[PDB]
Amino acid sequence: RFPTSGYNAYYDSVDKVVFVVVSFLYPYTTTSVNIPLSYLSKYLPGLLTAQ
Amino acid sequence: PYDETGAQVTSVSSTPFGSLIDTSTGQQILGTNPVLTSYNSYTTQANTNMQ
């Protein structure tokens, strides 16, 4: 499961959806890197409107 | 005139077209519209094609 503390749960209130983004697959899981906003505005039409 | 929050002002300032709030998915309308460029040279370009 994802953390109960030490996380970020983002609340897009324009699609009204609670999302968490985590770096997973190969190669690098170890080497955490912030996930962009760019491809996420694709897949949520409410990060295509507002924060 | 009387403004929002119960103030009164003399001034009018309008809403600008292409930064309104849509009811389409609760979005925001584009900065360039067909209606925009149609009016941005309305002198010919409001007379369109048949319409």
Curated annotation (Swiss-Prot), chain B:
Intracellular or extracellular location(s): Secreted, Cell wall, S-layer
Modification(s) after translation: Glycosylated. C-terminal glycosylation sites are modified with a heterogeneous family of glycans, with the largest having a composition Glc(1)Man(2)GlcNAc(2) plus 6-sulfoquinovose (QuiS).
Protein family: Belongs to the Sulfolobales SlaA family.
Function summary: S-layer large protein. May form the highly ordered outer sheath.
Assembly and interaction partners: The mushroom-shaped unit cells of the Sulfolobales' S-layers may consist of three SlaB subunits and six SlaA subunits.
Protein name (record): S-layer protein A
Organism: Sulfolobus acidocaldarius (strain ATCC 33909 / DSM 639 / JCM 8929 / NBRC 15157 / NCIMB 11770)
Part of the whole protein covered: 154 to 204 of 1424
